[PDB]
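Backbone shapes recur. Consider a single case.
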Amino acid sequence: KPLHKVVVCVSKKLSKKQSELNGIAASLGADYRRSFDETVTHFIYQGRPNDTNREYKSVKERGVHIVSEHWLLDCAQECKHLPESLYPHTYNGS
């Protein structure tokens, strides 16, 4: 369980795939919340440079890790806790 200290929350933006992303997180030992709260450590979000998305801005200011969906996908592929900084919300794929 590489993600044992993680609590993910899938952004509203990624609602279409929330169960998939939560399941990947749980497979790696993480917990998840269905909406954002003070227990979340990692917010899964896809956005753009200088993003004005409301939920993104809110989470950003709380200092929580904001990562691309590809952070979960690649952590699962590698069975490893990959660094968050390689997977900003502006990362769209390899």
Remarks:
- Helices lie at 18-27, 54-61, 69-78.
- DSSP finds three helices and four strands in the chain.
- Residues 1 and 29 are 4 Å apart (CA to CA).
